[PDB]
Amino acid sequence: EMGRPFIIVKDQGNKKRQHGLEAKKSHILAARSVASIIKTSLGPRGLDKILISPDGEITITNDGATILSQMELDNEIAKLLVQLSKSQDDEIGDGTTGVVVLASALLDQALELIQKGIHPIKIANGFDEAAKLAISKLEETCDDISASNDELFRDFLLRAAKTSLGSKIVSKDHDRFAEMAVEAVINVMDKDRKDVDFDLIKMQGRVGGSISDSKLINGVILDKDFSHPQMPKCVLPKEGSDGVKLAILTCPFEPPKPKTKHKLDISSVEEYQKLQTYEQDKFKEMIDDVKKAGADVVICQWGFDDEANHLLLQNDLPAVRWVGGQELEHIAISTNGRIVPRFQDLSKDKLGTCSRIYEQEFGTTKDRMLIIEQSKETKTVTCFVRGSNKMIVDEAERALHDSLCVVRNLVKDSRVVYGGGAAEVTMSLAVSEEADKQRGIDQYAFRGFAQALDTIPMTLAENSGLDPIGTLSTLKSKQLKEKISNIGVDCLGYGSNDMKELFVVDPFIGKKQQILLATQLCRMILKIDNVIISGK
Amino acid sequence: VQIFGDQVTEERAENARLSAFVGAIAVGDLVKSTLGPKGMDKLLQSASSNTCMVTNDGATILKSIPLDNPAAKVLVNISKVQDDEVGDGTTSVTVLSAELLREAEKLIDQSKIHPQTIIEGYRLASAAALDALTKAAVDNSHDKTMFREDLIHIAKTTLSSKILSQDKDHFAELATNAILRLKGSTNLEHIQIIKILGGKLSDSFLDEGFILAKKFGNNQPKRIENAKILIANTTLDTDKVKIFGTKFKVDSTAKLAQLEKAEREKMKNKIAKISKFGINTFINRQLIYDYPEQLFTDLGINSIEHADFEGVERLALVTGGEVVSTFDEPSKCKLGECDVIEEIMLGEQPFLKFSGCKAGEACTIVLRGATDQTLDEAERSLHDALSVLSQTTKETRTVLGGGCAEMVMSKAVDTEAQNIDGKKSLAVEAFARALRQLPTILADNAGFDSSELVSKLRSSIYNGISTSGLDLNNGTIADMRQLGIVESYKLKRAVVSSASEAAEVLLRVDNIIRARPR
Amino acid sequence: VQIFGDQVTEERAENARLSAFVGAIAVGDLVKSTLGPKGMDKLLQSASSNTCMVTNDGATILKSIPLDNPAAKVLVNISKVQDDEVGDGTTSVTVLSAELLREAEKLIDQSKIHPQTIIEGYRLASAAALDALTKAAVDNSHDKTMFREDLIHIAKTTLSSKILSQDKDHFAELATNAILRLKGSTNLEHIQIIKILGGKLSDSFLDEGFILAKKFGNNQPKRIENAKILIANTTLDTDKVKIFGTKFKVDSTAKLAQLEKAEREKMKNKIAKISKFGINTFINRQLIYDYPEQLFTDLGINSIEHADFEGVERLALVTGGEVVSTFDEPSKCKLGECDVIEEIMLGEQPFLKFSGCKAGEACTIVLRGATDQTLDEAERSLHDALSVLSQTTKETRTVLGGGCAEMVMSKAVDTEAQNIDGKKSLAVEAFARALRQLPTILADNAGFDSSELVSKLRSSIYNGISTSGLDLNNGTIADMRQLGIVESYKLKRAVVSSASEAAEVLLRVDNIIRARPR
Amino acid sequence: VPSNATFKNKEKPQEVRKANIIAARSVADAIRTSLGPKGMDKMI
Ligand SMILES: Nc1ncnc2c1ncn2[C@@H]1O[C@H](COP(=O)(O)OP(=O)(O)O)[C@@H](O)[C@H]1O
Ligand SMILES: Nc1ncnc2c1ncn2[C@@H]1O[C@H](COP(=O)(O)OP(=O)(O)O)[C@@H](O)[C@H]1O
Ligand SMILES: Nc1ncnc2c1ncn2[C@@H]1O[C@H](COP(=O)(O)OP(=O)(O)O)[C@@H](O)[C@H]1O
Ligand SMILES: [Mg+2]
Ligand SMILES: [Mg+2]
Ligand SMILES: [Mg+2]
Questions:
Q1: Are A230 and A334 found together in one domain?
Q2: Where in the cell is it found (chain D)?
């Protein structure tokens, strides 16, 4: 110091540092603080957690990403775990909890190896070689399902659909949600069974009713009523016709005006009466254009005019207003129609086709929500989910979203594996076997990853209330006795540690992603030596 | 290592379940007094502007009161959905869903049951519960006179809980006539409840017509006969053309005198087209200015101004006509009819009385009471009564109440508990014992015994009489068909499903995370 | 209006009650984990001086923790006096008192019974319980071998919950041998607890004679064979003469030198009076000055100074002689004899060990351990054991333990529950469920299923047999006479009587008046 | 198999025992450096 103010970085006294062994203990214990939150949540016997936002709204969730997303944290090590769960949620949409517990399991076993004095790069290189070795083994042992026909391929989705719904909300109607989830993909799929578009199916929840009232409808959900409700609510098609002849327009019902600011000057009373004639003839020509086109229901983006609503009621033409542009993207794909810009380009080939249009109340005074249904298979399915609470229907959205994402993973060819703790233990005993001859300096590194993989079965043992040591001892001895590797923890107590009888299936791409994100983050956290943090 | 930020309350221990369970018990005990016919009304003291509110419904109470517990929000939200869905039975969901968590508390503490086992028993117990209502229901659709009698007894049951327990004999006829008036239209927005303070509570009535909140403008008469009604949503007043870029290039003010005259000529021409229909009354939703108002005087047409758009829907259906605009084509357009129109006065504000209309697809109810607080209670009542009776038309099946609905569920639920031998039987019995408490609090509010009176109802049903229930005026068991009280199938299906699924929410918690307030 | 003043909390009949019951729940849940053999010890951190305290006794847990709740102060005081009376069983009073109020909370809410009616059921239920407890007891002390064996079983049952649960087979001999050496004298002041750091828990050995932490003088020898022991409550210090108010007027310092000669000659003649008996040691209560200390050298007398008040009686009873101060008449005051007066060292502090005394009416328990927190637990553990076994000498009747005393008492209560008419019979059954909840908690702390063992124990005892009990090591029902589990009759009588009075005080409350604190 | 004979409530003793173990081990890490001939001295 020598008396002068010895300052280097701006805000010297505010920020701190941390190094040596104490920097590591702050990292591993920070992961254990987050792991204790996730450990009592994972598995079918888990328990949701309740979160409270700053704005007073709550979300009852049991998906590691939504928990960590709405969690106000200060430690940076947990903030990387917040993004790891979000990484698993965005792409695969399955295993958020796992990626978190598993990364902590690698970190907890790494704490013992740091005490022995192994360099962190040798620790990180050991998990990288062990992770690829486990992926290379699990890719050989899993079987392909593409040889079976379409009738049995539907059953494999039901195996994974019941797996994803369980452990979550709506366990009561999970047998129907599995059929509803599989029925959504039967309508929306490619003929070659590959690269299905997920953006065609959007999520839509409704606060009201019960879970039993939910059903399948192929159409669009608009949160609005028809214009001037004097007409009958449920419009029917003609006796002989191809359909209702849906019409969509991105032009409001008005006289044509320039987009630029204009100044229409009327210097005479004769020109003023022609403006009145021009005002009326445009509305007369407008309703005659849609009349000759044969449209029954009209969809307007930018809304319309009081004077054309009456002109719409007499001709038996329902209509709506303030339909957003995102919904028109959904209407054109569902009804297979083309959105005309204006009336001069109006033609009968651009109009859509759907079965029927109708509206119901759902209760007393809530709001009139529009419903559309198709008479055949189309490229659009809109899940109509009901719920007794706002948190129930909110959790049912992200739960069913993860269900469709798990089925989306199975659309990729030859990616199936039997989970239930079997995938963890079958990848664990081989790593310990390789260490016996690949000893080197990294012998304990393989043993750490072998013990870290087994923690997820022990996590299931804690939630189920069984003895962990007796469970892992029986699974390890059974895997050594017989090379059949589809036996896992019987969480639901149906006997059978075997997993083919219990109809449970996980995506193979999802399971290998667990150790990848876990190992890739553990390689990053172990590199940190100096921890500089500034004050808020 | 505190990963969370400053001022972050987290509970990851037994206190989390205790804090979530005690919150529902506090919400549960708050509404135990409001259940039943002998229940006491509650009083709300607002924090802003001293605007008091008296209400018996649990949905309005719980939404108004502030509660920071996350468990309280679930009881608030399940009550809001029940209020919007059916409009009745909100306090039953609140007290039953809290009692299911109350009964589930001792299983967690004393017997040490897994939370997944308690919900698993409630799944099978709720399945057998709804199956009891499948066989216990009765369809009265084959006869309209019996269905007319069913709407009476449902009005007797719903209106008895509110302050109108004495006057329910008169409003039961008023309630059922409004439903037969609507002839199946379950939209509650088509009934205008005009609030009037003063007079006796039994002075309410239901006139065959639509009662306006406003009067005629300047000189149009009060009493007329054989008037043709024409409705418009038309500006019809100083017509600002659809493009606002219009202008007048005026070279001299004498020509601008002709332009303003031309605006009066087209308006004079528009009113001339109204006279081609040959009408005597004209109604428009926009407020009518002076110039078009004057031209109706010479033609002998009445004018009404500033009608609300929600009232135009009620006005069109009572009159039976159609809202007409673009009056060049009078042939295709339709207009209503009425026998007599007369302006009346109920209190200080005058109103327009319509009577003798052809169409009767809607109505208006005029309430009378001592205070705005009583009038409010009254309003909220008929809304809950008419909401249940409106859904009774689409759901004709009904279920007998008075403790018989909860007990016949428990008769089937207790039968199924033996065929599921193991530890799940205690969970299904807990679901059964939770249903016994609804007739218990109904007896406690009237000041009767909780054990002996429920024990007599227990023995009466197992003997082979599935029509026994509680009678609160005398304090003994009586037949429900003779007393004449019955609920709808959608109501009992809703409260059992809402209270069941509400119990599933706060049984799976194992941590409460509270971030900072904003 | 306002009747009390500022900063004064008042409660009335719904805030008054349910604040004591939740306080009874709050104080009961703390001591729930400490009950039984598999109970976990609670650690208390002081607010000042960073003083920690490891302790299992429920009284000591409530002594240190501050509790502003008035209802919890009742449980604080009843554990204090229970520790004063018996010394053991304070946790059972707090648990049984809390569960009696937990049951009575449900009888007031669910069954809607008056509080006075609940007490009248507890009076008859407590009378039936004590009558069954009196008849279930068994006589003892007729055979000294059986009396020796029962004290060993009582010591094993007492130390099973403390830290000495693993070494109770060895400490039972140390506990019971000291009590028989008292020769009927019931007093805990005759037993010393010497704190020694080092060793392990099972290194505590039985001492022959009496040992204490004192030291010889500067010039005294190490060993004297067959030493005569004397105890002086005397002042061998600067005696002064006691007519305070004596001063010395001096005309010349010649006689003042002879006056100081007389002071030394005065004390010389006093030490010469000691040598007339021919003793070998001299024990004084207070400090001995150097001039008396030098005079014991040539006469062959040992010297021990600064003896505590308790140490005088503790050493005199082992010696057999009486405390002498006058030293005038050598005829009376026959002294004892000790063979080995050689001191030993246990740790860093030498202790004077005696052996081969006339009588052993006072004893000393030498303890070895690692941490002082464990030695403090060792002190409180054996203090509860020696207190129970000391009162077992005067009160001979005993009763079987292992949870059988609770269920056999509830058998007569359930038998007398049927013939009592009215609503108080439910309160009589509530008392029975309170007795049943103690063995329910014993199974919870051990980690085994509680409903099965309580159901098997309850069904087994009603068959006709009354010797069955809970075996928490194996997790099944077994014979208590084989395992050797028995407790005193006055212990369970005090617990049931104190718990009955505990519920009686808190159930007769209707208002709370909390004045302003100083 | 599952949902029988127990349910482990009051997991705060498990959380407290973990906090006491890491608290004792963190103090032991400072004393661990002074072991053996190649240990170091401490000034307080
Ligand atoms: N019904 C079931 N039977 C057996 N195992 C299950 C069942 N449902 C889920 N699991 C297992 O529980 C583990 C954790 O899944 P979970 O945490 O619920 O999914 P996510 O991590 O995507 O939230 C998975 O490895 C899976 O194998
Ligand atoms: N006069 C009566 N006799 C017998 N039972 C009655 C009588 N009046 C009301 N009840 C019972 O009291 C209950 C009142 O429920 P209610 O207060 O309407 O619930 P909520 O307010 O939640 O809709 C009904 O289930 C009905 O069976
Ligand atoms: N070895 C044992 N086996 C079975 N039960 C025991 C055993 N030791 C004690 N108990 C039971 O524990 C209960 C309370 O023991 P106690 O010594 O009073 O503990 P505390 O001093 O903490 O109150 C007694 O009622 C007794 O039945
Ligand atoms: Mg999942
Ligand atoms: Mg009601
Ligand atoms: Mg004891």
A1: yes
A2: Cytoplasm
